[PDB]
Write a structure and sequence with these properties.
Chain E: It comes from Rattus norvegicus. This is part of a larger assembly, with two copies of chain A, one copy of chain B, one copy of chain C and two copies of chain D. By secondary structure, chain A is mostly beta strands. Chain A has one helix and 85 strands. The longest helix of chain A is centred in the middle third of the chain and has 4 residues. Chain C is low in regular secondary structure. The chains are: A mainly beta, B little secondary structure, C little secondary structure, D little secondary structure. The interface between A and E is medium-sized, with 33 and 35 residues. The structure holds a molecule of 5 linked components (NAG-NAG-BMA-MAN-MAN) (3 copies), a molecule of 2 linked components (NAG-NAG) (3 copies), 2-acetamido-2-deoxy-beta-D-glucopyranose (5 copies), calcium ion (2 copies) and nickel (II) ion (2 copies).
Chain lengths: 988, 5, 6, 5, 424, 5
């Protein structure tokens, strides 16, 4: 149906529309749709764009295939052609009328034209459009003639539609899903069930009656991206479905209150849906993260918890497809595809709190489909595409049997009443069949493409199926989960742990931090707990190489990396529950990103390694301060993964470069010793146990996990063999080592003592791009002086101003200076008062010592406006004169005092232009500068007055002077480039 | 290239 | 041009 | 010249 | 012997003589006994048995280890069950035991050739891509462990690592002194007995075979071109299958390769030619009618000039008069044209704008011409051989008829209707 | 156009 026209005047009350399907036709009907009549059905191929001439009671219609414009009376008897056999019409779309003209839009010429409405003469172009003009209308009172409204006296409850019927000229109607009552004026809501059939891009509500083909049980849900499953809540009349970015969407059956309800997961997109209508919770699958999680619907604030995850055991989630829940019984069921060397393809069950995992049916289940539950009969139904069958079995794991066979590709499956409904993606059919042995086959719909899951909307009484959570409202702080036997287990959202009360929640304080390239994730050290112990750090711009934690302050530090986007390189921190996302280090990151992060919790110092193309630096940043200092700068060596240990006050880093080794040094990167240099090729991660002082490292080139004591000596093999192909990161917690393996996609756990042969136990399985592992625990980061060997930096940074570096056997720390020179007292910092070097860098002035081995800045970076270009220093007043270039047309000469004391730059002269040279005459106290835009060398007094011109040259630069001999020299880089000499007065 | 700043 | 608008 | 993905 | 998962068949190729002869042995029929998705293949020349590892197909073949005669005339299912993601199958000819790798369970299994005594040899593997048995040892390669390992053939014990830290590991085989005299069969005892292909069978006998497009003569030694086969046309290729379902050989050299977007096909039995029409909406060169012999020779472009934007939409050859009726479709109008074979004569017999004939058939026996229309007024229309005296056979209860057929013995017109899902 | 694959 394309065209549509109306004549609501009291006499007519008729509607016209055009259809260009097979057997094209133009139809007339009463405004309530009763007296349907086909008026024109001959000499039409592609009808479109209807419009009514009200004074003459003629209907104008248009054809884009035969390329004509015609009109006829309301019965189609007096047909006439206004434009026919004419080449103006290419693909006309819409039509409108006014007085004696017809305006139509053409999709071929992309222009709006005008012509006489009776014979098509006086053709002209109204306007040209760069895009195809689709709709057109003429706004004028003549196009809306007045008439009596018969609906004014009508008492229709919802809709009063006009009609061509003489006695009343109106008829009462009501929206989709309502009944016309016997009184024919009121309408009541229809409580009958209906079948929701979600397709690839739309969800439809169709009646369970196979003889009804209207598809209008509810307002269709359009705009679906990739529809697989749908869910409903009969109370509150809401429909739920998932979307690609990881969100859940919600809309009522009447088409209103469409909104994004809550984000589901940051790690991927959800697949299946199951709603507990008694406790008001929704359970969904995330095949990307291979987990089953629940979201709370009851309250105003949303809470999400991962119930079951892939821990490598057969009793676990391999690749979940669909969920079915039994709120009264407290059981949750899901169908699972298998995983390699892991979970098999199975139908599994569990309590709705994630506990008591069980395997019900396993065997011929390749290409499993959605599972569904008959709560009354307590039987499970599922489809097996690889065998083209629908199978049935009891919830206890018995009486498995084939119900429907010879199917092509079942996708949808729901059982209601005494019948079974299934949608077959091939055969493009929705079909109903008896649940008892599958006879009496009936077709509801056919020739419907992109079929997907099915579900029946029906009224469910939570009062007749109450469970523990409904009997005990407000018992749990965040999430209530039903448990078999009428009990209930309270739960907390991801990132929180249940308090000893059993009813309250507290943040996690003991968990492992696992960093991958896509995201940073946290898992509880209690292996039975599949919940996420941290809000995952996932999203755009995340490419994580390493992660470190600050347990006392509750932060997780990670370094992003990108070889294409420069702005996505740096060091970030965030709270384990989200909250304060922050950028820590962003300036000066090398071509290769940050390659290691080490945090000294005792001193608050953050050690990181940035790698340039042919060199690398080890740097300290003091947390919550702008103090940054480079400790070691090497080119032949390449430190990559660095760990800090405040207890023994040492720094360790792996190299894996051209001469692989593990190095040891003080907290200021001094006294560098080599620990292991033989039998090492690619060390990618270091670890330490604070109570034993052993350095643990992994090497994927030798497939080695080995340890060496902090003092050096023998290297002891902990794990070796072909079964450990790519150990990438390692940490030591208690009596166990925990490492990630990229090839095996697993997080392992095994004893730290060498010589053990017990197989490692998998924490999580099927994680892509594993990078590192880190422990978030108080015991891993002690702060008391008793165990930290009385670290001096604990007591107010040890009294230092910028940096505090403790030494392994000394009682006093070596204070480090980020900028300036350490004072005589050994703790304060002041300006260098030495001979050094200065230079300009975009909008700043920076300093540099003459010693390449000295990494301390003579003074802190001075920020200026515009772009500093040329520099010169005045000894008498300790000030530097510099030019600023602004908007490529103007420039300033400004000076800043090096006495510090909160001195800021101030301008001496403005409105010059591009100025690329300064030379200060220390004898005569005059500033000589080369104005490139104005093409002269000019001299002014120290205070900026009595400026005078020296000479005019093509392109000046780099003025130098020698007052003791009265000569100045400059370079002209224009045509005939040369170095010119003139007296300080500009003569000779 | 260009001998600018 | 195809007379379908989508 | 080192890692990505 | 080699398997092609793209065509889903197991094929044999000779490398004895100067001319290469190829043949398809087992093809993907409906039954589970056929070929679903062949991964590996092992042979036993002395006993005429062939073994291959197969993934499943939906509602068709299950994932299995299968055995068959080397001429493909006796299919069998040996082992089925927990065989998700099967790897290659290797045969120990000495002890007559098969070895497989199951990636889903991460195990290497062993079983006898007769379908008995299945048991797991090696556990806790990650991705055992390839394996081979030689002597008393078993060598396998693991793609995720990046290791090549040797274990005993009787048990996974006594593991020894040969290579490690090697990426992109794949299948394995042992180059050794296989002797063509210690193992003998019917083809070795009877050289140059068959014309093209000799395939041994159990019992020391042999069965002759012919290349694709050829079949055995009644003498049992010679080959002759196929006389009765179906011509199945698809977008990527044109293929021919025997009309008796036991023969899985390609009864015709498949017309495929670059430039094939075949819409329809027709045959010229007397002259031995197959006509088809290519269609490309972008390249104007890939539009037209071409012909070829069923054996793959004498390729020729039949119609290449004057094809509309919508291309040729149907071809029907009048084998009695040598006329080739075809339908040439434009954006807003459609032509019906005749071309006389081996002549330059070509003319148009009807131009229609509102109608659109798409698929056309001809019956020289009754001197009638039928075409199917799926435009705005779907219908099946009949006319004389000059498209001049038209009538409508079906005008109601028909939406998008895209196929026609003639019985030639009962006078009925068969058509397929995909919008109403029926054959009438 | 119907089938251009
Ligand atoms: C249009 O032009 C194309 C351009 O190539 C031509 O192909 C085509 O001309 C020819 O049409 C004739 C029709 O009869 C074809 O001749 C037939 O070939 C048959 C196959 O011959 C092969 O196999 C036989 C096996 O015995 C072998 O002897 C041959 O040497 C060859 O390998 C052949 O079986 C058939 O023989 C019948 O008719 C003969 C007439 O003399 C009798 O002698 C014989 O007893 C038997 O009754 C016949 O010769 C020919 O193949 C074909 N041209 C080519 C190159 O294929 C033109 N015709 C049209 C309109 O399509
Ligand atoms: C709004 O308008 C619609 C259309 O009239 C009405 O929908 C019908 O309502 C009736 C009564 O609720 C339904 O009748 C019930 O049918 C059930 C079985 O359904 C199958 O068979 C019927 C035909 O009999 C088909 O129409 C249907 O598609 C199914 O194939 C029965 O199991 C029900 O029986 C139950 O109640 C009776 C009476 O108490 C008991 O005797 C039984 O033991 C059992 O408990 C019942 O007969 C009918 O199915 C509905 N049709 C549709 C379209 O679904 C709404 O009633 C109407 N609502 C209002 C407010 O007016
Ligand atoms: C750089 O700057 C950032 C801020 O931008 C600092 O981050 C703060 O670090 C402090 C560390 O003390 C954090 O404060 C701590 O929060 C803990 C949790 O508080 C919650 O729970 C408690 C108990 O139920 C509630 O009372 C409270 O309202 C919160 O709901 C507390 O348990 C800690 O208490 C301990 O220390 C305080 C003194 O700080 C004592 O009074 C207590 O008795 C107890 O010993 C503590 O309050 C703070 O939350 C962080 N803020 C942010 C924004 O993250 C970094 O510390 C700083 N960097 C460095 C290296 O110092
Ligand atoms: C370099 O110097 C220019 C001129 O002083 C300065 O504009 C740049 O700083 C920032 O550049 C941003 C992009 O134009 C601009 O959005 C921002 O406002 C601006 N900051 C100031 C103080 O104006 C400097 N850029 C760099 C890379 O250092
Ligand atoms: C609109 O078109 C009509 C013709 O349909 C024009 O009327 C003709 O104008 C010419 C030139 O003045 C006269 O010689 C003819 O006698 C007129 N009549 C006809 C029927 O040809 C009319 O001028 C046009 N008006 C405009 C403004 O375009
Ligand atoms: C659904 O949307 C409607 C319209 O926004 C809400 O109904 C009214 O909304 C206005 C504006 O927010 C409020 O001032 C009224 O109080 C609302 N009235 C009622 C009866 O609620 C309605 O709240 C929304 N419902 C839900 C649950 O989303
Ligand atoms: C951290 O986040 C909390 C909650 O949004 C906010 O109240 C607090 O001010 C933030 N603190 C800092 C320093 O960002
Ligand atoms: C550390 O370096 C200093 C200065 O080079 C040196 O005297 C000392 O022997 C080195 N060893 C230690 C651990 O003190
Ligand atoms: C240089 O040239 C013009 C003309 O002498 C002078 O007015 C101007 O101030 C100078 N600088 C600039 C901004 O062009
Ligand atoms: C057909 O092919 C054969 C073999 O290539 C060749 O000898 C013969 O000349 C060809 N005939 C024509 C008409 O091209
Ligand atoms: C063919 O059309 C002619 C008119 O030209 C008509 O008289 C005759 O009935 C038609 N013949 C058949 C076989 O329908
Ligand atoms: Ca047109
Ligand atoms: Ca390795
Ligand atoms: Ni599927
Ligand atoms: Ni594999």
């Amino acid at each position: 149906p394309r065209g549509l026209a109306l004549d609501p005047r009291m006499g007519d009350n008729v509607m016209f529309w055009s259809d260009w399907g097979h057997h094209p036709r133009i139809e007339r009907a009463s405004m309530d749709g009763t007296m349907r009549t086909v008026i024109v059905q001959e000499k039409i191929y592609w009808p479109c764009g209807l419009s009514i001439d009200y004074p003459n009671r003629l209907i104008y219609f248009m054809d884009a295939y035969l390329d004509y414009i015609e009109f006829c009376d309301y019965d189609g008897h007096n047909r006439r052609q206004v434009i026919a056999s004419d080449l103006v019409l290419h693909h006309p779309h819409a039509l409108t009328l006014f007085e004696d003209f017809v305006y139509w839009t053409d999709r071929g010429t992309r222009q709006v034209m005008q012509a006489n409405k009776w014979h098509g003469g006086n053709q002209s172009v109204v306007m040209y459009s760069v895009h195809q003009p689709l709709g057109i209308t003429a706004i004028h009172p003549s196009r809306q003639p007045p008439s009596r409204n018969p609906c004014a006296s009508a008492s229709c409850s919802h809709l009063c539609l006009l009609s061509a019927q003489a006695p009343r000229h109106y008829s009462c109607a009501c929206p989709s899903g309502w009944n016309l009552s016997d009184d024919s004026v009121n309408c009541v809501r229809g409580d009958q069930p209906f079948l929701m059939s979600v397709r690839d891009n739309i969800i439809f509500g169709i009646s369970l009656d196979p003889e009804v083909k209207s598809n209008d049980a509810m307002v269709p849900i359009s705009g679906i991206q990739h529809g697989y499953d749908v869910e409903f809540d009969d109370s509150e009349q809401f429909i739920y479905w998932v979307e690609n970015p990881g969100e859940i969407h919600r809309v009522k059956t009447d088409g209103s209150n469409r909104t994004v309800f809550a984000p589901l997961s940051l790690l991927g997109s959800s697949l299946g849906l199951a709603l507990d209508w008694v406790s008001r919770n929704i359970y969904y699958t995330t095949p990307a993260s291979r987990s089953i999680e629940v979201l709370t619907l009851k309250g105003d604030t949303r809470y999400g918890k991962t119930l079951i995850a892939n821990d490598g055991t057969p009793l676990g989630v391999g690749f979940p497809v669909g969920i079915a829940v039994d709120p009264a019984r407290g059981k949750l069921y899901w169908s699972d595809h298998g995983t390699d060397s892991g979970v098999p393809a199975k139908i599994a069950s569990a309590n709705m709190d994630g506990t008591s995992l069980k395997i019900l049916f396993t065997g011929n289940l390749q290409h499993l489909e959605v599972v569904t539950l008959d709560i009354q009969e307590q039987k499970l139904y599922w489809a097996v595409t690889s065998r083209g069958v629908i199978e049935r079995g009891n919830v206890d794991g018995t009486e498995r049997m084939i119900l429907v066979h010879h199917l092509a590709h079942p996708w949808g499956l729901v059982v209601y009443g005494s019948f079974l409904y299934y949608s077959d993606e091939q055969y493009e059919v929705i079909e109903r069949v008896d649940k008892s042995s599958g006879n009496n086959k009936v077709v509801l719909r056919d020739n419907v493409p992109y079929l997907r899951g099915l579900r029946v909307y029906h009224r469910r009484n939570a009062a007749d199926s109450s469970n523990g959570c409904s009997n005990n409202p407000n018992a749990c702080q965040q999430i209530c989960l039903p448990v078999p036997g009428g009990m209930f287990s309270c739960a907390c959202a991801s990132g929180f742990k249940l308090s000893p009360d059993g009813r309250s929640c507290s943040p996690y304080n003991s968990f492992m931090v696992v960093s991958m390239l896509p995201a940073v994730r946290g898992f509880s050290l209690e292996l039975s707990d599949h919940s996420e112990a941290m809000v995952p750090v996932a999203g755009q711009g995340r490419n994580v190489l390493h992660a470190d934690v600050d347990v006392a302050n509750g932060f997780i530090y990670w370094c992003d990396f990108s070889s294409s986007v420069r702005s996505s390189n740096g060091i970030r921190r965030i709270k384990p529950d989200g909250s304060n996302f922050t950028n820590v280090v962003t300036y000066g990151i090398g071509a290769n990103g940050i390659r290691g992060v080490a945090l000294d919790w005792a001193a608050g110092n953050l050690y990181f390694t940035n790698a340039f193309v042919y060199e690398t630096l080890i740097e300290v940043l003091r947390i919550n301060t702008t103090y940054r200092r480079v400790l070691l700068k090497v080119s032949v060596d390449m430190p990559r993964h660095i760990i800090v240990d405040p207890k023994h006050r040492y720094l360790f880093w792996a190299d894996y470069g051209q001469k692989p080794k593990i190095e040891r040094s003080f907290l200021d990167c001094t006294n560098r010793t080599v620990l292991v240099s033989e039998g090492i090729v690619t060390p990618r991660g270091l670890a330490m146990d604070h109570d034993t002082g052993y350095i643990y490292w992994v090497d994927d080139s030798l497939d080695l996990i080995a340890r060496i004591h902090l003092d050096g000596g023998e290297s002891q093999v902990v794990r070796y063999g072909s079964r450990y192909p790519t150990p990438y990161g390692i940490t030591v917690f208690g009596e166990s080592i925990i490492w990630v393996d990229r090839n095996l996609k697993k997080v392992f756990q095994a004893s730290k003592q060498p010589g053990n042969t017990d197989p490692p136990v998998v924490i999580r399985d099927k994680i892509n791009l594993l990078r590192d592992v880190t422990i978030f625990d108080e015991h891993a980061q002690p702060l008391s002086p008793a165990e930290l060997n009385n670290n001096p930096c604990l007591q107010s940074n040890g009294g230092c101003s910028h940096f505090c570096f403790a030494l392994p056997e000394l009682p006093t720390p070596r204070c480090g200076c980020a900028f300036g020179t350490l004072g005589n007292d050994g703790k304060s910092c002041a300006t260098s008062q030495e001979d050094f070097l200065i230079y300009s860098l975009n909008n700043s002035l920076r300093s540099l010592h003459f010693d390449p081995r000295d990494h301390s800045l003579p003074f802190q970076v001075i920020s200026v406006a515009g772009t500093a270009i040329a520099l010169d220093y005045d000894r008498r007043n300790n000030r530097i004169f510099f030019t600023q270039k602004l908007n490529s047309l103007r420039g300033q000469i400004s000076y800043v005092s090096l006495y510090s004391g909160s001195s800021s730059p101030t301008v001496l002269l403005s409105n010059i232009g591009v100025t690329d040279g300064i030379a200060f005459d220390w004898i005569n106290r005059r500033i000589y500068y080369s104005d490139f835009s104005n093409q002269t060398i000019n001299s002014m007094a120290e205070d900026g007055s009595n400026r005078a011109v020296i000479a005019r040259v093509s392109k000046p630069r780099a003025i130098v002077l020698d007052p003791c001999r009265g000569y100045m020299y400059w370079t002209d880089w224009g045509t005939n480039a040369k170095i010119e000499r003139a007296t300080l007065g500009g003569n000779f | 290239x260009x001998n600018x700043x | 041009x195809x007379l379908x608008x989508x | 010249x080192e890692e990505x993905x």
